[PDB]
From a paper:
Here we determined that the arbitrium system in Bacillus subtilis phage phi3T modulates the bacterial toxin–antitoxin system MazE–MazF to regulate the phage life cycle. AimX also inhibits the function of phi3T_93, a protein that promotes lysogeny by binding to MazE and releasing MazF. In all structures, phi3T_93 shows an identical all-helices fold composed of a longer N-terminal helix (α1), followed by two shorter helices (α2 and α3) connected by a long unstructured loop forming a V-like shape. The α1 helices of two phi3T_93 monomers interact, resulting in a W-shaped tight and globular dimer that displays two shallow grooves, one across each side of the dimer molecule.
The structure of the AimX–phi3T_93 complex showed that a phi3T_93 dimer binds two independent AimX molecules that are accommodated in the shallow grooves. Only a short fragment of AimX (residues 8–22; 30% of the protein), which folds as a 3-turn helix, is visible in the AimX–phi3T_93 crystal. The main contacts between AimX and phi3T_93 are nucleated by the projection of AimX M14 and M21 towards the hydrophobic bottom of the phi3T_93 groove generated by the side chains of K13, K17, W16, M20 and L23, pointing to these hydrophobic interactions as key for phi3T_93–AimX recognition. Additional polar and hydrophobic interactions stabilize the complex. The portion of AimX visible in the structure corresponds to an area of high sequence similarity with MazE and YosL, explaining why all these three proteins bind to MazF. Despite the structural differences between phi3T_93 (all alpha fold) and MazF (mainly beta fold), both AimX and MazE use an identical recognition mechanism by introducing a helix in the groove in the dimer’s interface. Structural alignment showed identical residues in the helix of AimX (M14, Y18, E20 and M21 for AimX) and MazE involved in the interactions with the corresponding partners, and YosLphi3T also presents identical residues in these positions. To test the potential binding partners of AimX, we used biolayer interferometry (BLI) assays, which showed that AimX does not bind to the master repressor phi3T_97 but binds to both MazF and phi3T_93. Interestingly, the affinity is more than twice as high for MazF than for phi3T_93. AimX can also bind to phi3T_93, preventing it from binding to MazE which would release MazF.
Residue numbers in the entry:
A (entry chain A): 2 to 67
B (entry chain F): 10 to 22
C (entry chain B): 1 to 67
D (entry chain C): 9 to 22
Write the structure that this text describes.
């Protein structure tokens, strides 16, 4: 409850803004540029802890699972 | 998956 | 009351993390401008009910979350 | 900018 940033109102905003961005990723050529960027980033130290999310995004596995 | 995020939006009621 | 099947806390975490990955993508050269052009169209798309504040926070460069 | 706010929330997760 003492969280300043990871809050339920913010989670809500992120969820909605993420849906807005997902439909952008469908736009022509955005898809392939995103996968290309994920490729460029796969060896990058700043993304330790994000391996499962990188894999799900590159493999086409869903953003959320039931 | 957008459909699933949408369903998840339907659950914020 | 139904327990949530999609808007679960574990999904909120993955979406949060996946959103950070896409944020850095949006900074890539050319992506930002094509994003803003996409927001300019979508703002008129009648399939987005209740997203108006989010569409304009994004279009006008407001932060994704609020302290 | 807004990414560092995201990152601070992430470090607030665990
Ligand atoms: Ca490395
Ligand atoms: Ni209009």
């Amino acid at each position: 409850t003492n969280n300043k940033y990871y809050t339920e109102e913010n989670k809500k905003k992120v969820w909605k803004k993420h849906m807005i961005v997902l439909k952008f990723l469908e736009q022509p050529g955005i898809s392939e540029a995103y996968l290309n960027y994920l490729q460029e980033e796969i060896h990058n130290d700043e993304w330790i802890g994000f391996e499962n999310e990188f894999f799900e995004e590159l493999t086409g596995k869903p953003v959320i699972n039931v | 998956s957008y459909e699933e995020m949408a369903k998840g939006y339907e659950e914020m009621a």
